């Protein structure tokens, strides 16, 4: 019936580290969004700017899906007008965000015993990110007056940090997989669509 490839985003074997978050465009497919907001397998499911029960009745130009992995705490920050390490240095939604933030516990996949170190987040940066900007830089962060010259040291940090997920932690420290649906409404009179 030409259904949208939602499974490809949600059920991928591996997700991207939040500093290098992955982005997929959905197009040329009929999408039933209810099969997402009626699933209780998503522990958190947040919508801004739009009414979820009216998503199948709206007209979009663009539809983006950003996937990545963070920890339970930081899901707070995937929202308009939030602060903190993730919202400031990794992934920021603008205040006029119109879309939805879906996140679910991925303890049994992304947390191994002794730590899973493949998931990194950016821990130092000289300035905050603009909304929907991603940085994948590896430049050394100068925290002191002594210049760095690209050499890591006590005052010159590597800018990224592993999570080191372990399944025994509490839920706030446990890995959560996140998908952000971003929408682009069609400009039209209301007799046409909205």
């Amino acid at each position, epitope marked *: 019936s030409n259904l949208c490839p939602f499974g490809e985003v949600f059920d991928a074997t591996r997700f991207a580290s939040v500093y290098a978050w992955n982005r997929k465009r959905i197009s040329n497919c009929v999408a039933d969004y209810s099969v997402l907001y*009626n699933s*209780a397998s998503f*522990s958190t499911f947040k919508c801004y700017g739009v009414s979820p029960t009216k998503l199948n009745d709206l007209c979009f130009t663009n539809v983006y899906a950003d996937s990545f992995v963070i920890r339970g705490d930081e899901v707070r920050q995937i929202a308009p007008g939030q602060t903190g390490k993730i919202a400031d240095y990794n992934y920021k939604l603008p205040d006029d965000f119109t879309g939805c933030v879906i996140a679910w516990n991925s303890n049994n996949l992304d947390s191994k015993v002794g730590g899973n170190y493949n998931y990194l987040y950016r821990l130092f940066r000289k300035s905050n990110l603009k909304p929907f900007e991603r940085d994948i830089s590896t430049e050394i962060y100068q925290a002191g007056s002594t210049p760095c010259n690209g050499v890591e040291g006590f005052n010159c940090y590597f800018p990224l940090q592993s999570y080191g997920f372990q399944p025994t932690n509490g839920v*706030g420290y446990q890995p959560y997989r996140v998908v952000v649906l971003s929408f682009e409404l069609l400009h039209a009179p209301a007799t046409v669509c909205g």
Partner: nanobody
Amino acid sequence: QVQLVESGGALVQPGGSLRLSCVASGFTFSSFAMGWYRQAPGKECEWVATITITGGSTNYADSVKGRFTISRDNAKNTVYLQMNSLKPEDTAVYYCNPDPGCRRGQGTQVTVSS
């Protein structure tokens, strides 16, 4: 900003029932999916129950499957957790949150003791 006020918790005897509640403010409730979590002294915060935006589907944790029920009233910005056949192991501070974690709101204390 955001406010999450839980309530309803008291000391019940084993086997008993309890209906916990919380009221949310600071965001369009009708449009968020809500979860319940619990934190026990000397233990870590764990997830208890999840309910969809519409309340149509519900997911529960294996330690409470069959004994607990999560519900939602959008007209009152309130979510409810009915707790049946309470074990002493369910004694913890209970929190409600659209995001993961405990301690966001003040929570409410539930003590199952005989």
